[PDB]
């Protein structure tokens, strides 16, 4: 049968985390992060927040030895249909995220938040 | 752009003529008035082609499928194994959208 393809069991969850414009400006739960469940620590894909000018993000290490900081891409503006009126949110990509994982964020976003 | 993924049932098979009945589920995108099918989801490994009758009614359209990706979903009546086919020449971006939609909507193992 030629070759063999197999998709590993990967799941996309979300969690509250800190973010900001400076290294120190990252403070308690100002955004929501999209991450991947992988054995070699968590792989954060994108950030979703209500702020327009964010550059850094903090995450506690999976083992617990310390903290990690990640650079953010320029945000992508989009609108969600919220029952209490449409709300505008800002979506931040990881500074070095490839277009493949970018699509995963979009498919997960359209499935976890009400778009358009 | 703020894009949303919808799904529909369609026909597929191993040959051009083998595309019959309703043996697969397709992931498509709402673009302009038309539809952009991204991937195919079915319970068969034989699939190579997929057919759609044209909306106007002049004929039918066929699209070549990539080698399937095997995966297992947790269904209440026992785990079922499904095969996922991408459309020929799909860019890595739209590939993730199909994968991202599945990983957030279905429990795999």
Distance, CA of B69 to CA of B80 (rounded, Å):
14
CA A24 to chain B, closest CA, distance in angstroms equals: 32
Nearest by Cα to A56 from A20, A29, A17, A30: A20
Q: Are the Cβ atoms of B67 and A3 closer than 8 angstroms?
A: yes
Nearest by Cα to B95 from B38, B29, B43: B38
Exposure class string for A25-53: b at 16+ Cβ within 10 A, else e: ebeeebbbbbbbeeeeebebbbbbbeeee
Nearest by Cα to B39 from B53, B50, B23: B50
Q: What resolution does the deposited structure have, in angstroms?
A: 3.0
Q: Are the Cβ atoms of A104 and B96 closer than 8 angstroms?
A: yes
For residue A32, what are the β-bridge partners?
A: A16, A48
Distance, CA of A55 to CA of A71 (rounded, Å):
6
Residue pair A45/A19 in contact (Cβ under 8 Å)? The answer is: no
| CATH class of the structural domain B5-109 | mainly beta
The coordinates were experimentally obtained by X-ray
- Give domain A12-116's CATH architecture: Beta Barrel (2.40)
Residues in B touching A79 (Cβ below 8 Å): 2
**Residue boundaries of the structural domains of chain A:** 12-116
Residue pair A13/A109 in contact (Cβ under 8 Å)? The answer is: no
Q: Are the Cβ atoms of A107 and B93 closer than 8 angstroms?
A: no
């Amino acid at each position: 049968n030629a070759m063999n393809n197999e998709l590993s069991p990967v799941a996309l969850r979300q969690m509250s985390c800190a973010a900001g414009t400076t290294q120190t400006a990252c403070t308690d739960d100002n955004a929501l992060a999209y991450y991947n469940t992988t054995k070699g620590g968590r792989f954060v894909l994108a950030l979703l927040s209500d702020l327009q000018d964010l550059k850094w993000a903090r995450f506690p290490k999976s083992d617990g030895t310390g903290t990690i900081y990640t650079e953010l891409e320029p945000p992508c503006r989009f609108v969600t249909d919220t029952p209490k009126g449409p709300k505008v949110k800002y979506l931040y990509f990881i500074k070095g995220l490839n277009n493949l994982n970018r699509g995963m964020v979009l498919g997960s976003l359209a499935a976890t938040v009400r778009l358009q």
